[PDB]
């Protein structure tokens, strides 16, 4: 681990799934597609001025995506913001920063 580096990968927890459910409206808006249930599978975290979560999610038709979700600092009410994502990922693709 280096300062600002990503943590090791861990299986998704209910708290990570909740973060995915909370930002789904932002994902649909940016991709202009609807996703139905996005299932969190694995995740990494990264300390920034706040926290970024890199989350591998499984979508429909067995497609995967990597979501980047920024949890704001307390001063900004810990607002969750979907700040990036990578589409067409494979189940076993590594979660790397982006």
């Amino acid at each position: 681990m280096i300062p600002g580096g990503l943590s090791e990968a861990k299986p998704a927890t209910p708290e990570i799934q909740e973060i995915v459910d909370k930002v789904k409206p932002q994902l649909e808006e940016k991709t202009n597609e609807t996703y139905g249930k996005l299932e969190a599978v694995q995740y990494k975290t990264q300390v920034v001025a706040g926290t970024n979560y890199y989350i591998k999610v499984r979508a429909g038709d067995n497609k995967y995506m990597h979501l980047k979700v920024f949890k704001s600092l307390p001063g900004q009410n810990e607002d969750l913001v979907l700040t990036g994502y990578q589409v067409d990922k494979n189940k076993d693709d590594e979660l790397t920063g982006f």
Binding site: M1, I2, P3, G4, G5, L6, S7, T45, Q46, V47, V48, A49, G50, T51, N52, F70, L73, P74, G75, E78, T83, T96, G97
Partner: protein, 220 residues
């Protein structure tokens, strides 16, 4: 110097900055240390460019918004022969192409010194050298919510550090539990977080959060 040290009082430290959503703490910690060393050697305080580091120090081992080390940044300033001022190379919070311009270099270093892994050695360096770059375990909820007093997190790690910050001093305050000593630490999360953007981290409590595990400063 003792029993308290606060380099802010002597003009060695720039106002608190904000790394935003980019994992560039390491670059803010490095410019903070370089700003203090250049002040010592020139009597002038100039805010330096984190973006220059984020964009150009990959060859030295840094990973832009995905992390890096303050020593690598010091190595880059030595190898490149300079670092641009903040005004000339502004912060964008995303990794961009290297656009270093030697015309606007306002700092430089010859390398760096790694402090022994002891809080006693760290105290000696802060007192005698100036602000020091350090890595800490900042990955807990208690750190996000820090606002006052001396930070102590029982679950803090002394070996796995995920954030780079800057020790500007140390001091004490009377406390209910008699854990009174702290390191004065400048963070890069903006002035609203914490105590004006700073955090008093527990000092002399067995290298709390690893503050003394990866401490260093540039040689100017």
């Amino acid at each position: 110097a003792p029993r308290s040290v606060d380099w802010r009082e002597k003009g060695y430290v720039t106002p608190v900055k904000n790394q935003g959503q980019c994992g560039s703490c390491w670059a803010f910690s490095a410019t903070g240390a370089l700003e203090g060393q250049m002040f010592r050697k020139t009597g002038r305080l100039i805010s330096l460019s984190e973006q220059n580091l984020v964009d150009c120090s990959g060859p030295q081992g840094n990973e832009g918004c995905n992390g890096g080390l303050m020593d690598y940044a010091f190595q880059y300033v030595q190898d490149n022969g300079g670092l641009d001022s903040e005004e000339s190379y502004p912060y964008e919070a995303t990794e961009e192409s290297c656009k270093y311009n030697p015309k606007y270099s306002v700092a430089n270093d010859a390398g760096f010194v790694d402090i022994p892994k002891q809080e006693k050695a760290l105290m000696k360096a802060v007192a005698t050298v100036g602000p020091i770059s350090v890595a800490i375990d900042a990955g807990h909820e208690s750190f996000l919510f820090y606002k006052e007093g001396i930070y102590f997190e029982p679950d803090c790690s002394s070996e796995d550090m995920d954030h780079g910050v800057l020790v500007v001093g140390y001091g004490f305050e009377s406390t209910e539990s008699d854990d009174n000593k702290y390191w004065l630490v400048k963070n890069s999360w903006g002035e609203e977080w914490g105590m004006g953007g700073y955090v008093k981290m527990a000092k002399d409590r067995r290298n709390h959060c690893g503050i003394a595990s990866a401490a260093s400063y540039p040689t100017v």
